[PDB]
Amino acid sequence: HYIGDLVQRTEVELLKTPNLGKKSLTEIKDVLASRGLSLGMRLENWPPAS
Amino acid sequence: YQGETTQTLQDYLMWQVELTPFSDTDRAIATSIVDAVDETGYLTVPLEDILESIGDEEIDIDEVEAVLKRIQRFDPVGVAAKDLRDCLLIQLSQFDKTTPW
Amino acid sequence: RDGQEEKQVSFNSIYMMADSGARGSAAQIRQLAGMRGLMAKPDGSIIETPI
Amino acid sequence: ARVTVQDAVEKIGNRFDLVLVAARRARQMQVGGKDPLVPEENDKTTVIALREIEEGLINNQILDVRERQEQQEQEAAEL
Amino acid sequence: TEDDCGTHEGIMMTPVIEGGDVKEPLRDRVLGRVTAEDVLKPGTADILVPRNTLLHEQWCDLLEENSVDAVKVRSVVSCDTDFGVCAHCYGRDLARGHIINKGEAIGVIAAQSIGEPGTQLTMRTSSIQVKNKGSIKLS
Amino acid sequence: ITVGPYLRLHQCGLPKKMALELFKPFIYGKLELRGLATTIKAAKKMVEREEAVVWDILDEVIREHPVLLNRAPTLHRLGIQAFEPVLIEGKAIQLHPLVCAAYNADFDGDQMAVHVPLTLEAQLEARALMMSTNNILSPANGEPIIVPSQDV
Amino acid sequence: DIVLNPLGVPSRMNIGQILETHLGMAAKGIGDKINAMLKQQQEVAKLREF
Amino acid sequence: CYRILGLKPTVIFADQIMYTGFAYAARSGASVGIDDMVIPEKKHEIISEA
Amino acid sequence: PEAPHDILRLRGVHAVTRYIVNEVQDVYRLQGVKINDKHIEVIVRQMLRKATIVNAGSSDFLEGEQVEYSRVKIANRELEANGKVGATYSRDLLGITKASLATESFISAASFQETTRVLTEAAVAGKRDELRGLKENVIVGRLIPAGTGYAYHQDRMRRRA
Amino acid sequence: HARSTGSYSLVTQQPLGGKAQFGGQRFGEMEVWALEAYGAAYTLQEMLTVKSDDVNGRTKMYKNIVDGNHQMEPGMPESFNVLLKEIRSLGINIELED
Amino acid sequence: MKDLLKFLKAQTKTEEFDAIKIALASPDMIRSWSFGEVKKPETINYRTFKP
DNA sequence: AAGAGTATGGGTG
Ligand SMILES: [Mg+2]
Ligand SMILES: [Zn+2]
Output the CA E82–ligand 2 centroid distance in Å: 9
Q: Identify all chain I residues contacting J87, using CB atoms and an 8 Å cutoff.
A: 119
Within a domain: J5: no
Q: Burial level of A19, CB count in 10 A (0-12/13-18/19+)?
A: exposed
CA I92 to C1' L5, whole Å: 28
Give the span between the Cα atoms of F137 and F146, in whole angstroms: 8
Would you call J93 helix, strand, or coil by DSSP? strand
Contact in structure between F130 and F84 (CB atoms under 8 Å): no
Angle at E88 between CA E82 and CA E94, to 5 degrees: 115
According to DSSP, the residues that pair with E24 across neighbouring strands are E16
Give the span between the Cα atoms of I14 and I7, in whole angstroms: 9
Question: In whole angstroms, how far apart are CA H26 and each of G3, G6, H20?
Answer: 11, 12, 10
Indicate which technique resolved this structure: cryo-EM
D34: Cβ contacts below 8 Å, ≥ 6 apart? D28
Residue of B91, B3, B77, B89 lying closest to B41 (CA atoms): B77
Give the span between the Cα atoms of I127 and I140, in whole angstroms: 18
Question: C1' nearest to CA of I114: which nucleotide?
Answer: L11
F33: Cβ contacts below 8 Å, ≥ 6 apart? A42, A43, A44, J68
Residue of E53, K51, F137 lying closest to H6 (CA atoms): F137
Angle at B74 between CA B70 and CA B78, to 5 degrees: 90
> Cα-Cα-Cα-Cα dihedral of B41, B44, B48, B53, to 10°?
-90
Give the span between the Cα atoms of F117 and J27, in whole angstroms: 14
> Cα-Cα-Cα-Cα dihedral of B34, B40, B41, B45, to 10°?
-60
Residue of F69, F10, F64, F20 lying closest to F46 (CA atoms): F20
Give the span between the Cα atoms of F58 and F102, in whole angstroms: 30
Within a domain: J73: yes
Q: Inter-axis angle of helices B24-35 and B61-71, to 10 degrees?
A: 70
Between chain C and chain G, the number of residue pairs with CB atoms below 8 A apart is 22
Whether residue F73 is preceded by a cis peptide bond, meaning omega within 30 degrees of 0, is yes
Would you call F143 helix, strand, or coil by DSSP? coil
Q: Is F108 on the interface with G (CB under 8 A)?
A: no
Phi/psi of residue K17, nearest 5 degrees: -155, 160
Whether residue A47 is preceded by a cis peptide bond, meaning omega within 30 degrees of 0, is yes
Flag if K18 and J76 touch (Cβ within 8 Å). no
The DSSP output letter for G8 is G
Q: Burial level of B15, CB count in 10 A (0-12/13-18/19+)?
A: middle
Within a domain: J4: no
Mutate to test the interface with I, among D14, D16, D18 (most CBs of I within 10 A): D16
Give the span between the Cα atoms of F12 and F112, in whole angstroms: 12
Flag if F142 and I36 touch (Cβ within 8 Å). yes
Phi/psi of residue F82, nearest 5 degrees: -100, 140
The DSSP output letter for D34 is P
Give the closest-approach CA distance of D6 to chain E in angstroms.
Answer: 11
Domain extents in chain D: 1-79
The amino acid sitting at G34 is I
Sheet holding I50-53, edge to edge: I66-68, I50-53, I89-91
What chains are in contact with K, requiring at least 3 Cβ pairs below 8 Å? B, I, J
Give the span between the Cα atoms of F57 and F53, in whole angstroms: 6
Phi/psi of residue K36, nearest 5 degrees: 170, 170
E60 in a labelled binding site = no
CA I94 to C1' L5, whole Å: 25
Q: Is the CB of I132 under 7 A from strand L?
A: no
Would you call F117 helix, strand, or coil by DSSP? coil
Tell me which nucleotides of strand L come within 7 A of a protein CB. 11-12
Q: Kindly report the number of other CB atoms within 10 A of residue I88's CB atom.
A: 12
The DSSP output letter for E100 is P
DSSP tally for chain E: helices H, then strands E: 4, 6
Within a domain: J83: yes
E5 in a labelled binding site = yes
What chains are in contact with H, requiring at least 3 Cβ pairs below 8 Å? C, D, F, G
Contact in structure between G5 and F106 (CB atoms under 8 Å): no
The conformational region for residue E45 under phi > 0 = left, psi -120 to 50 = alpha, else beta, is alpha
Q: Identify all chain C residues contacting H32, using CB atoms and an 8 Å cutoff.
A: 13-14
Q: Identify all chain K residues contacting I117, using CB atoms and an 8 Å cutoff.
A: none
Give the span between the Cα atoms of H23 and H37, in whole angstroms: 27
Give the span between the Cα atoms of J73 and K13, in whole angstroms: 12
The conformational region for residue J39 under phi > 0 = left, psi -120 to 50 = alpha, else beta, is left
Q: Identify all chain J residues contacting B4, using CB atoms and an 8 Å cutoff.
A: 7-10, 16, 21
CA D58 to C1' L7, whole Å: 74
Q: Is the CB of I117 under 7 A from strand L?
A: yes
Residue with CA nearest to L11's C1' atom: I114
* Range D1-79 classified under CATH 3.40.50.2000: no
Q: Is the CB of I84 under 7 A from strand L?
A: no
Give the span between the Cα atoms of D68 and D75, in whole angstroms: 11
DSSP string for H4-44? HH-SHHHHHHHHHHHHHHHHHHHHHT----GGGSPPPTTHH
Q: Identify all chain D residues contacting H8, using CB atoms and an 8 Å cutoff.
A: 3-4, 6
Give the span between the Cα atoms of D19 and B37, in whole angstroms: 48
CA I62 to C1' L2, whole Å: 26
Within a domain: J9: no
Q: Which ligand is nearest to the CA of E77?
A: 2
Is there contact between J and B if contact means ≥3 C-beta pairs under 8 Å?
Answer: yes
Q: Kindly report the number of other CB atoms within 10 A of residue A27's CB atom.
A: 13
DSSP string for K23-51? EE--HHHHHHH-S----------SSS---
Contact in structure between C12 and C23 (CB atoms under 8 Å): no
DSSP string for I110-140? HHHS-HHHHHHHHHHHT-EE---SHHHHHHT
Q: Is H11 on the interface with D (CB under 8 A)?
A: yes
Give the closest-approach CA distance of D66 to chain H in angstroms.
Answer: 33
Residue of I136, E38, J29, K43 lying closest to F72 (CA atoms): J29
CA-based end-to-end distance of chain G: 29
Q: Is E101 on the interface with D (CB under 8 A)?
A: yes
CA I116 to C1' L3, whole Å: 34
Contact in structure between E76 and E85 (CB atoms under 8 Å): yes
* Number of residues in chain I: 161
According to DSSP, the residues that pair with F84 across neighbouring strands are F11
- For residue F86, how many C-alpha atoms fall within 13 Å in the half-sphere facing its CB? 13
Would you call C14 helix, strand, or coil by DSSP? helix
Question: C1' nearest to CA of I117: which nucleotide?
Answer: L11
I93: Cβ contacts below 8 Å, ≥ 6 apart? I4, I5, I8, I16, I47, I48
Question: C1' nearest to CA of I112: which nucleotide?
Answer: L12
Question: In whole angstroms, how far apart are CA A9 and each of A12, A19, A33, C32, D10?
Answer: 8, 16, 15, 80, 45
DSSP tally for chain I: helices H, then strands E: 9, 4
Give the span between the Cα atoms of D53 and D55, in whole angstroms: 5
B6: Cβ contacts below 8 Å, ≥ 6 apart? J7
Flag if B18 and J12 touch (Cβ within 8 Å). no
Within a domain: J82: yes
Q: Burial level of B76, CB count in 10 A (0-12/13-18/19+)?
A: exposed
Q: Which residue of F has its CA nearest to E97?
A: F142
Q: Kindly report the number of other CB atoms within 10 A of residue A31's CB atom.
A: 12
Sign of CA dihedral B81, B84, B87, B90: negative
Give the span between the Cα atoms of I119 and I110, in whole angstroms: 7
**Resolution of the solved structure (Å):** 2.6
J19: Cβ contacts below 8 Å, ≥ 6 apart? J1
Task: Count how many domains chain J has.
Answer: 1
Radius of gyration of chain K (CA): 19
Q: Which residue of J has its CA nearest to F139?
A: J37
Residue of B16, E91, H44, F77 lying closest to I42 (CA atoms): E91
E24, containing H or E segment: strand E21-24
B12: Cβ contacts below 8 Å, ≥ 6 apart? B75
Contact in structure between C28 and H46 (CB atoms under 8 Å): no
CA E110 to C1' L9, whole Å: 37
Within a domain: J81: yes
Angle at J4 between CA I144 and CA I137, to 5 degrees: 15
Give the closest-approach CA distance of H19 to chain G in angstroms.
Answer: 17
Range of the domain at J31: 14-98
Report H helices in chain B. Answer: 9-18, 24-35, 47-54, 61-71, 84-93
Whether residue B76 is preceded by a cis peptide bond, meaning omega within 30 degrees of 0, is yes
F110 in a labelled binding site = yes
E75: Cβ contacts below 8 Å, ≥ 6 apart? E10, E11, E89, I17, I41
